[PDB]
């Protein structure tokens, strides 16, 4: 029993965190094989950030300008190249702690673990979701740039996020490990804002299934709904549309609890129109949307890595 916001064990990623320094700017890098990946804005000064020409700022740098520290060991940079908004620093030493990994680009609604780092040293691990507006509600301070988001499938670490910036509302923006930003964001000091966010409907349904598995059924009802009527109600409450793919993905949880997906949608419909009436679900007075259907199955079955 119990249901917690659970992150993947971060050990395989901790062995990849390094400190990257260029001039006065210090941030984090991910050392995989003989390459260190970090945000390209490490080459910028505060004036450079206002309108950076990254190719022009980069051409002025030599390998010895990038100080890379792996614990208390300085790595020597033997090459440097840019791929989108990520800077790739070729080093002489391959990371002996390099796990089996892949670079994956995730979709909004998908969750991942973030290993927050400062000066190449991991400070904490938390779970979060890629919001439908492509921001993440992270917990980051100055120096956290280069911290990474990941998932683990079997023994393979799938790197999906690299932290680049904080938006005016305190939410975060970053890229995949190929340097492509999630969202309409740019790595530049200019006016940028998170778009109006929506609730990840399939994740709320997965969390309602987790609550039923954990013994909370007060919200269930005798009712069902059509997928189209539920989507009219979801549109009204700033909830993401629920697709047939989402219904299919919820199949295993539906079979385990004996509550049809559209049966759970009618419980959600009632919660949206009426609220919780002073009650909680899994210790929350809000409908939680940062657990995917897979996260619920993984936690309610004890999958290991």
Ligand X SMILES: O=C(Cc1cc(F)ccc1F)Nc1cncc2ccccc12
Where along the sequence are the contacts to ligand X (CB under 6 A)? 1, 41, 49, 140-142, 144-145, 164-166, 172, 187-189
Q: Is 189 in the site for a second copy (CB under 8 A)?
A: no
Least Å from the CB of residue 41 to ligand X:
5
Catalytic residue among 22, 145, 160, 265: 145
CA distance 158 to 178: 13
Of the residues 38, 41, 44, 117, only one is catalytic, namely 41
Nearest to 158 by CA among 126, 110, 117: 110
The neighbouring-strand residues paired with 22 are 25, 66
Radius of gyration over alpha carbons of the chain, in Å?
Answer: 21
Question: Which of 215, 228, 274, 277 touches a second copy (CB under 8 A)?
Answer: 215
Distance CA 18, CA 71 (A): 7
Q: Which does 49 bind (CB under 5 to 8 A by kind): a second copy, Cl ion, ligand X, none?
A: ligand X
The single-letter DSSP state of residue 222 is S
* Least distance to a second copy, CB of residue 136, Å: 9
Residues 70-99 that bind a second copy (CB under 8 A): none
- At its nearest, how many Å lie between a second copy and the CB of residue 118? 5
**Nearest distance, CB of residue 157 and a second copy, angstroms:** 12
Residue 142 vs 244, nearer CB to ligand X: 142
CB atoms within 10 A of CB 247: 19
41 counts as catalytic = yes
For residue 247, what are the CA distances in angstroms to 68, 112, 230, 260? 47, 22, 12, 9
H-assigned helices in 10-70 = 11-14, 46-50, 54-59
- Nearest distance in Å: CB 75, Cl ion: 27
Taking CB within 5 to 8 Å according to partner kind, which of ligand X, a second copy, Cl ion, none is near residue 99?
Answer: none
Q: Does 181 bind Cl ion (CB under 5 A)?
A: no
For the window 20-59, what string marks contact with Cl ion as x by the rule CB under 5 A?
---------------------------------xx-----
> Contacting a second copy (CB under 8 A), which of 128, 157, 177, 234?
128
The candidate with the shortest Cα–Cα distance to 13, out of 152, 135, 129, is: 152
- To the nearest 10 degrees (0 to 180), the angle between helices 261-274 and 227-236 is 30
Active-site residue, 128 included: no
**Pairwise CA distance, residues 268 & 221, whole Å:** 10
Instruction: Candidates 37-45, 120-128, 157-165, 240-248: pick the segment binding a second copy (CB under 8 A).
Output: 120-128
* Token pair 């100080």: residue: 67
Q: Which of 283, 107, 270, 305 is nearest to 210 (CA)?
A: 283
Could you list the residues that contact a second copy (CB under 8 A)? Answer: 1-12, 14-15, 115-119, 121-128, 137-141, 143-144, 166, 170-172, 214-215, 280, 283-286, 298-305
Could you list the residues that contact Cl ion (CB under 5 A)? Answer: 53-54
């Amino acid at each position: 029993s119990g249901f917690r916001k659970m992150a993947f064990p971060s050990g395989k990623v901790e062995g990849c965190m390094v400190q990257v320094t260029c001039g006065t700017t210090t941030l984090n890098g991910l050392w995989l094989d003989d390459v260190v990946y970090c945000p390209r804005h490490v080459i910028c000064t505060s004036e450079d950030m206002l309108n950076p020409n990254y190719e022009d700022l980069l051409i002025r740098k030599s390998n010895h300008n990038f100080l890379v520290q792996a614990g208390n060991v300085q790595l020597r940079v033997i090459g440097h190249s840019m791929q989108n908004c990520v800077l790739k620093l070729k080093v002489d030493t391959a990371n002996p702690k390099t796990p089996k990994y892949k670079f994956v680009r995730i979709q909004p609604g998908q969750t991942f673990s973030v290993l927050a780092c400062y000066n190449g040293s991991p400070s904490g691990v938390y779970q979060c979701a890629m919001r439908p507006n492509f921001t993440i509600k992270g917990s980051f301070l100055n120096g956290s740039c280069g911290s990474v988001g990941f998932n683990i499938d079997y023994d393979c670490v799938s790197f999906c996020y690299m932290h680049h910036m904080e938006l005016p509302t305190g939410v975060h923006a970053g890229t995949d490990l190929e340097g492509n930003f999630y969202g309409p964001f740019v790595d530049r000091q200019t006016a940028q804002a998170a778009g109006t966010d929506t609730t990840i409907t399939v994740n709320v349904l997965a969390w309602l299934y987790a609550a039923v598995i954990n013994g909370d059924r007060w919200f269930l009802n005798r009712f069902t709904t059509t997928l189209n009527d539920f989507n009219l109600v979801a549109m009204k409450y700033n909830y993401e549309p629920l697709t047939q793919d989402h219904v299919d993905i919820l199949g295993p949880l539906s079979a385990q609890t004996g509550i049809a997906v559209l049966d759970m949608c009618a419980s959600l419909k009632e919660l949206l129109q009426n609220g919780m009436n002073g009650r909680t679900i899994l210790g929350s007075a809000l409908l939680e949307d940062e657990f995917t259907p897979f996260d619920v199955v993984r936690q309610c079955s004890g999958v290991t890595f």
